[PDB]
């Protein structure tokens, strides 16, 4: 049971806490006396249950939980996939190819290029840039249930930071095991955010819509809207940077309406420690806190778009 409270700051009532200062009992190295230590969890990590406010971990009623080791890192490194003897991997080398159909210029290789396993949603990060015009690929364009994978030609510079000098409390749940709690925050209480150059994003989006009219009629209206709803991993730009798992609001990137014919875009980002990626139940990972302000610069190299069924099809 977590006896939590608001983080030390000064109002307003619209700050909705977000950060919780949880105090609780804990087992020490010995199997006798307990331990009254406190930690700092995000609101997305906790959930109240019905005297002061008492909470619990959001995964305790779903599955077990294991802490990620601080020795390993979640930094995506290039991985070449190779085929054994007697086998071979063919590579299509045309500048224009929607992934399906006959390929004019085919070459063979033993190992593919370095493909970094970057796990993200909505925005494709650190991927391979397309040739000439940006590419549009889909299993079935006529089917609005099939996703539309977009590949960029010019990368869109994106900057994400964690303006919170966190502290790692290493409380000892011995013998052997040790939990890494979040101590007090040094400095100002700020929220994570991502910046996208308004100039770059305007040209890139306008370069995509010109390719969308090649499939949805030359003189048609293309409108961009945010997600419909559901899980946090689907409605937000989920990614990893510096060990933390960000969840950014993409309502500022897909807020446009294109007809037939100087700063940065800041995006509200949330941070969750207890995650369950790949739609997996039974294995919940608690990402340990990271000391110091985290900064990362990535490449927006593609999008994952979906089309609505409301139609009115030959119009917009």
């Amino acid at each position: 049971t977590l006896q939590c409270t608001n983080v030390t700051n000064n109002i307003t009532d619209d700050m909705r806490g977000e950060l919780k200062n949880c105090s609780f009992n804990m087992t020490t190295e010995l199997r006798d006396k307990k331990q009254k230590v406190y930690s700092l969890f995000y609101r997305l990590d906790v959930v109240q249950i019905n005297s002061n406010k008492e909470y619990r971990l959001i995964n305790c009623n779903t599955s077990a939980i294991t802490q990620a080791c601080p020795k390993v890192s979640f930094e995506p490194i290039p991985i070449h996939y190779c085929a054994p003897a007697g086998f071979a991997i063919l590579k299509c080398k045309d500048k224009k190819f929607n992934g399906t159909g006959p390929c004019p210029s085919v070459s063979t290789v033993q190992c593919t290029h370095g493909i970094k396993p970057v796990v993200s949603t909505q925005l494709l990060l650190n991927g391979s840039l397309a040739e000439e015009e940006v590419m549009i690929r889909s299993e079935n364009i006529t089917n609005n249930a099939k996703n539309i994978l977009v590949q960029f030609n010019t990368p869109v510079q994106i900057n994400c930071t964690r303006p919170n000098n966190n502290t790692r409390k290493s409380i000892r749940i011995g013998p052997g095991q040790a939990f890494y709690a979040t101590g007090d925050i040094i400095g100002d209480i700020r929220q994570a955010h991502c910046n996208v150059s308004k100039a770059t994003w305007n040209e890139t989006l306008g370069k995509v819509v010109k390719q969308l009219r090649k499939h949805f009629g030359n003189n048609t209206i293309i409108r961009f809207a945010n997600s419909s709803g559901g899980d946090l991993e689907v409605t937000t730009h989920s990614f990893n940077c510096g060990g933390e798992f960000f969840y950014c609001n993409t309502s500022g990137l897909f807020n446009s309406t294109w007809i037939s014919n100087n700063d940065s875009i800041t995006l509200p980002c949330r941070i969750k420690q207890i995650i369950n990626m790949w739609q997996r139940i039974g294995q919940a990972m608690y990402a340990p806190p990271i000391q110091g302000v985290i900064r990362c610069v990535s490449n927006i190299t593609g999008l994952i778009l979906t089309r609505d069924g409301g139609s009115t099809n030959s119009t917009t």
Partner: antibody, heavy 132, light 108 residues
Framework: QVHLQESGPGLVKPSETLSLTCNVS????????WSWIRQPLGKQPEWIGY???????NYNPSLKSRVHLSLDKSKNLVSLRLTGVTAADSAIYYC??????????????????????????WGKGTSVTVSS | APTFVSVAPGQTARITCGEE??????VIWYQQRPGQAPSLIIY??????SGIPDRFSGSPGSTFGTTATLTITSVEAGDEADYYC????????????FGEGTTLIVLS
């Protein structure tokens, strides 16, 4: 030049209503912020509250339900009212102009900032003693 | 509650007021001559208004975990007075009471 002058009764009975007035000369009371500061003998100054036009007026949470401020644009002066006075209110009340400032530490757009006030031009001050 | 700081003439005086910084601050300093009204010396950590010499400097409100410090170079007999501070912390509520003052003693 900016000259400020405070004037009051000097003596107020317990459980009564203290009324003070800050006569302002050299500037208009509508184009500035106005704050009141009191200070007991041998203690640190205590901020009472600031008053401004367009309804922008806030008080001291400790003296919230007893203090009242107002601005007379016709007579060009600042007023003060304190109901239910005690021996703890016996101090020296000052009238000073107030200039606002904005301290930015975050990203501005996310309201990651705060406004700070500071008095630059004070007055001579008035003496208020509470005794029966 | 009261504190004292004695500094020889021509030297450098240092004044500590308020609690330790928890966030980004905007410390406002004030000087109160005996028998007079408090006067503004330094607002916004280290910004002096018109009429105040550059001898008076304050610690920047960007250092986390330190107290507000008022530095007075070339200490003169005229600087002998009380000094209060108004702490504006982004982690602390609005302080409606100035910090406990510090008396500057000019020796000799």
């Amino acid at each position: 030049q900016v000259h400020l002058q405070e004037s009051g009764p000097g003596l107020v009975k317990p459980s009564e209503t203290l009324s003070l007035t800050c006569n302002v000369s050299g500037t208009l009371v509508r184009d500035n912020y106005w704050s009141w500061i009191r200070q007991p003998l041998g203690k640190q100054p205590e901020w009472i509250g600031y008053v401004h036009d367009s309804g922008d007026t806030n008080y001291n949470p400790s003296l919230k339900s007893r203090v009242h401020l107002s601005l007379d644009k016709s007579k060009n002066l600042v007023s003060l009212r304190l109901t239910g006075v005690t021996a703890a209110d016996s101090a020296i009340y000052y009238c000073a102009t107030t200039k606002h400032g904005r301290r930015i530490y975050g990203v501005v757009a996310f309201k990651e900032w705060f406004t700070y006030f500071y008095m630059d031009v004070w007055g001579k001050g008035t003496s208020v003693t509470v005794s029966s | 509650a009261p504190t004292f700081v004695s500094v020889a003439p021509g030297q450098t005086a240092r004044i500590t007021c308020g609690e330790e910084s928890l966030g980004s601050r905007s410390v406002i300093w004030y000087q109160q001559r005996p028998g007079q009204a408090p006067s503004l010396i330094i607002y916004n950590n280290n910004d002096r208004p018109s009429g105040i010499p550059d001898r008076f400097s304050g610690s920047p409100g960007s250092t986390f975990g330190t107290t507000a410090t008022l530095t007075i170079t070339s200490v003169e007999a005229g600087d002998e007075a009380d000094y209060y501070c108004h702490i504006w912390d982004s982690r602390r509520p609005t302080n409606w009471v100035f910090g406990e003052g510090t008396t500057l003693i000019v020796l000799s």
